[PDB]
Design a binder for this molecule. Structure first.
Ligand SMILES: Nc1ccn([C@@H]2C[C@@H](O)[C@H](COP(=O)(O)OP(=O)(O)OP(=O)(O)O)O2)c(=O)n1
Ligand SMILES: [Ca+2]
Ligand SMILES: [Ca+2]
Ligand code: NA
Ligand code: NA
Length: 328
DNA sequence: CCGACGGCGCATCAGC
DNA sequence: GCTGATGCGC
DNA sequence: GTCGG
């Protein structure tokens, strides 16, 4: 990684602003800058050089000059020695504990893994499961395992109803050699933007995956989105595979292209693309792309026949999934 | 200078 | 119970 | 924290 020291520093600052300062726009600012620096194909020699990149301003340029000259940033060294910051940054690593909950636990004297394990009864369901699998959820998933997981999900969904189509998206669809979690986009002809002709379309799939012991726990579940935990079966005498996070999202069949654009990510890519759409006078969500009237009210959905159509509306050349990651 | 920053599903809570 | 805000996550 | 109007 050409500028890994810099992007690491900016990521650490982003996490501080999100988790401790609760300043979401500074978090996004740092992440935007980290991403543009990550794709820059030269080893950066100064802050002024970095300043020419969109998303890098005066303050970040100064931090880059300090980092290049000293290998460190005093602001981060300080943050690293602050007990309250350190504690909040740690607690937020548990799925379900955000900036607010982290600060509340710290105020109650709950600030270590051991404290959390003593106080399960103060956690909501999501948080309890996040704690249970804390170690497992920090492990990455090799692509070879994602392929085994894909097999299972696609075959089990087919057993429920051959009319379902499940597509694995996120970093996997972007060609990543390892993934943080699994994202499954689901469609069925009876669920469209105009009607739902069958109930329990998502439920019956979750149920099948629970029945075969693939899905092990549930963080949250509604009519269109499941967030939970899964695990590959292991063989005789073999150590068990780590538990993995899995997201399943049922999308209207006729809005698949907006859906898959959304579900493919990355997060920064989607934010950047949607911000560009706004500048071009459009709004993109997972369902539709719509024009904005001068009032700033979204108009009627535009025809979409491919992922590329969405890019054409906003006057972007098509980006293949592989070029939608944070690093190139 | 300064308003705006992507957009939304599910869980939880406050007020009626 | 519903409605709307907040937290957290994708 | 950054940037376009
Ligand atoms: N804030 C976010 C987060 C995610 N997304 C979309 C929706 C989601 O499906 C897709 C992937 O998100 P994930 O958080 O799963 O991240 P990746 O798959 O890119 O990377 P990893 O799992 O290997 O760490 O990107 C998004 O619009 N906005
Ligand atoms: Ca993922
Ligand atoms: Ca995910
Ligand atoms: Na810049
Ligand atoms: Na968290």
């Amino acid at each position: 990684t050409l500028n890994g020291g810099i992007t690491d520093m900016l990521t650490e600052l982003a996490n501080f602003e999100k988790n401790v300062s609760q300043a979401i726009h500074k978090y996004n600012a740092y992440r935007k800058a980290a991403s543009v620096i990550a794709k820059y194909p030269h080893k950066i020699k100064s802050g002024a050089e970095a300043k020419k990149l969109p998303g890098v301003g005066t303050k970040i340029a100064e931090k880059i000059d300090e980092f290049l000259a000293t290998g460190k940033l005093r602001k981060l060294e300080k943050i690293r020695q602050d007990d309250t910051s350190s504690s909040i940054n740690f607690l937020t690593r548990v799925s379900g504990i955000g900036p607010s909950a982290a600060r509340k636990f710290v105020d109650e004297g709950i600030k270590t893994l051991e404290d959390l394990r003593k106080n399960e009864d103060k956690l909501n369901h999501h948080q309890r499961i996040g704690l249970k699998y804390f170690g497992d959820f920090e492990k990455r998933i090799p692509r070879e395992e994602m392929l085994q997981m894909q097999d299972i999900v696609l075959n089990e969904v087919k057993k429920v109803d051959s009319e379902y189509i499940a597509t694995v998206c996120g970093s996997f669809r972007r060609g990543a050699e390892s993934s943080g979690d699994m994202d499954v986009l689901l469609t069925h002809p009876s669920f469209t933007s105009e009607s739902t002709k069958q109930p329990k379309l998502l439920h019956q799939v979750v149920e099948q995956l629970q029945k075969v012991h693939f899905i092990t726990d549930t963080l949250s579940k509604g009519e269109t989105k499941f967030m939970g935990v899964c695990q590959l079966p292991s063989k005789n005498d073999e150590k068990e595979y780590p538990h993995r996070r899995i997201d399943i999202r049922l999308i209207p069949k006729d809005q698949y292209y907006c859906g898959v654009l959304y579900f493919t990510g990355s997060d920064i890519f989607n934010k950047n693309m949607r911000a560009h759409a706004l500048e071009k006078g459009f709004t993109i969500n997972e369902y539709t792309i719509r024009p904005l009237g001068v009032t700033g009210v979204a108009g009627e959905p535009l025809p979409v026949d491919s992922e590329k159509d969405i890019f054409d509306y906003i006057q972007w050349k098509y980006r293949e999934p592989k070029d939608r990651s944070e690093h190139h």
